[PDB]
Amino acid sequence: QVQLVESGGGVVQPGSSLRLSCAVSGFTVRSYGMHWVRQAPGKGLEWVALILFDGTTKHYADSVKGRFTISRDNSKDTLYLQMTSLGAEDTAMYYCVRDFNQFVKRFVDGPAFDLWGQGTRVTVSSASTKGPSVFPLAPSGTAALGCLVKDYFPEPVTVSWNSGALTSGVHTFPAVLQSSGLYSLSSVVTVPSSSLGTQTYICNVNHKPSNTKVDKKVEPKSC
Amino acid sequence: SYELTQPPSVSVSPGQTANITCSGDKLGDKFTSWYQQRPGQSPVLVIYQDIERPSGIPERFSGSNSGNTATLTISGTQALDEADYYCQAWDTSTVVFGGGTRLTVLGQPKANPTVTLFPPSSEELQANKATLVCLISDFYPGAVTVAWKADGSPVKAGVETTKPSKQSNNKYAASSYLSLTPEQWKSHRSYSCQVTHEGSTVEKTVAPTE
Amino acid sequence: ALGKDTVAVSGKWYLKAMTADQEVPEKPDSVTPMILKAQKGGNLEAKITMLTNGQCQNITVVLHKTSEPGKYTAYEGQRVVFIQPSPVRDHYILYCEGELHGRQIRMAKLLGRDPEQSQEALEDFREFSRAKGLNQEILELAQSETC
Ligand SMILES: *[C@@H]1O[C@H](CO)[C@@H](O)[C@H](O)[C@H]1NC(C)=O
Ligand SMILES: *[C@@H]1O[C@H](CO)[C@@H](O)[C@H](O)[C@H]1NC(C)=O
């Protein structure tokens, strides 16, 4: 019986108009000022918009002002956020929250968000499920041999090394989105320079969401 | 517009009291609110109306908004308190959030970053693209700043950085990617990645030349 | 610190009854719910819309706090506003001594959380108004919601 639950989350393209919605229980939405708060991956919190219990009083951040709309259906007990003209900036985990000092029996000029949703993620990019471009990262008395997975739109992805022959020295890094709207990730194995002399090294990447699996032989790249 | 300001990071030992601060004009004429965002969780109101504590929140947490700054104080600080705290206040028909303060309850000896720079891949170059790769590892506490220099001049675009992530060693690790044209890459003398952790800097530089 | 009583009177109110000791020339056709915002520093900000002659007056008034709890001042000290709770729940009584439009006027206003008129609340409001000396009519007002 969780009091706030968001929906509308997923993936979109710059030229889109996704509508998020927050389903409320425990109280009526006509009774509280209700706010939306985004949080970008890695970044901190950012207030988006509020709608007072007045229902006629609505304010938005200048960032979104003109592009976004906030609204609610007292009957359905649901709060909405109509996002339009979506940017790459808009990509975030969107939360709906209740200003408990904006209640019909308690209006204090000091917004306080007691009730926090669990959120709903939004990703904005004009790209269909794409597969990784996997370039090697060559070493230059131990060495660091890597692999750069780049440009894979479906969030999930995996990496292996020598098809599981390498177990130690291997670390994979979280991915990062880009302006392109495509993820990019990396991984490296710490290796004896003696092993770099002979032992061969291939990284085995898997991007199931695109139905692809790439292997790459990392080598000195001497010249 | 109106902006709240907090230290990016604060560190305390178990038991030691922690003092996170929020700064802005007309605070103390404004009501402030404090939120706790534990690792990977949703935000939680810890202090409202400057000093008022919601139910469930322990007494260890306390508020204050004297003059143009407001403070969140945590006595008996313990592992559970390790989280990102944000302050918030209303102004100009907007709700202002601070940038937050990663609070680390030091429970491990401090660790210095090992940094590893990689140049664009011949293959990538041939692909009509270029990406420089900065790989920071084995650092604690879990905060780090990354600065790219093009021949000593700062680079501020096409840079992507990850939040630090915990590792099996219980230390943190992060990465930064610099994108540029193949022309940009061979028309500068060197490119350099600078990584500051707990005052000290590790820098690593590479060259378009082998 | 902020007054627990000042917070207790914050939020949406319906203006219901309205006695006086003098005739009020201008009367609104209908009124929008009254909103009382508690501010830092103990002051209450108060907004209401009065639909009158087919037009919406958008009132904003700040009740400045005093040394006496319950006593608030407004219009640059020109009007006092005592705020007392009714024995009937979800109802408050305002009592405005002062002067407005260059005219001394004593009014009393019945506030309620719910628009539904309570005959017990109205009774008590009359009894009080009469005891204070407000012995004119008791306008129960038309509660519209928007313009
Ligand atoms: C934190 O700041 C408050 C400000 O009044 C002070 O009373 C307290 O002693 C401080 N404690 C620490 C740990 O600095
Ligand atoms: C009157 O009050 C309403 C209610 O909030 C508001 O929307 C409007 O802008 C105000 N202005 C007028 C028309 O007097």
Author numbering:
A (entry chain B): 1 to 140, 147 to 229
B (entry chain A): 2 to 211
C (entry chain C): 5 to 151
Which statements did the authors publish about this structure?
Eight dog (Canis familiaris) allergens are included in the World Health Organization and International Union of Immunological Societies Allergen Nomenclature database, among which Can f 1 is a major allergen (Pomés et al., 2018; Schou et al., 1991). Like most mammalian respiratory allergens, Can f 1 belongs to the lipocalin protein family (Flower, 1996; Virtanen et al., 2012). Lipocalins share low sequence identity but have conserved structural motifs, characterized by an N‐terminal 310 helix, a C‐terminal α helix, and a central calyx formed by two antiparallel β‐sheets that enclose a central hydrophobic cavity forming a β‐barrel for ligand binding (Dartt, 2011). In summary, the structures of Can f 1‐hIgE Fab complexes revealed two unique and partially overlapping epitopes on Can f 1.
The hIgE mAb bound to two partially overlapping epitopes and recognized two different Can f 1 conformations. The epitope region is defined by residues Leu6, Val11, Ser14‐Lys16, Ile39‐Lys44, and Arg117 (S.1A). No crystal lattice contacts are observed in the epitope‐paratope region. Interestingly, the Can f 1 residues Val11 and Ser14‐Gly15 that are recognized by both antibodies are in the protein fragment that has different conformations in the structures we determined. However, none of the Can f 1 structures (conformationally different) including nCan f 1, showed the presence of ligands (fatty acids) in their cavity, and the physiological ligand of Can f 1 is still unknown.
